[PDB]
Ligand binder design. Sequence first.
Ligand SMILES: O=C(O)c1scc2c1OCCO2
Length: 119
Amino acid sequence: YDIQAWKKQCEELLNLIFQCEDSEPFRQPVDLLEYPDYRDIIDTPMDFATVRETLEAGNYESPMELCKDVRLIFSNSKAYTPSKRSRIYSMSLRLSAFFEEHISSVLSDYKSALRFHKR
Ligand SMILES: O=C(O)c1scc2c1OCCO2
């Protein structure tokens, strides 16, 4: 029932993601010199360093907000990919499964703790 526990749990999950080779294309903002049409397809770029910095700045109020930004990294990869068999998109799918598998309990514990607070 710790309402604040999600933050360190998300920090640790981000550390695991950064160690994962599958996160390499997503660690920093997509290089617009390497992909000049990126902003023609993608309205809101997102990457893991931006997620970590937002968390560390105290700019997420809940793990659901962090989850929305991480999911945006994956949906941007899906929208930008020229193929569902592309290398970078395939890395995003594996990383998304890993993230969803690990974020589930963080969200559940947070929601449980908030419900206990409001009881
Ligand atoms: O070049 C590709 O196949 C892909 S698939 C997703 C991407 C990307 O390149 C830039 C980052 O997002």
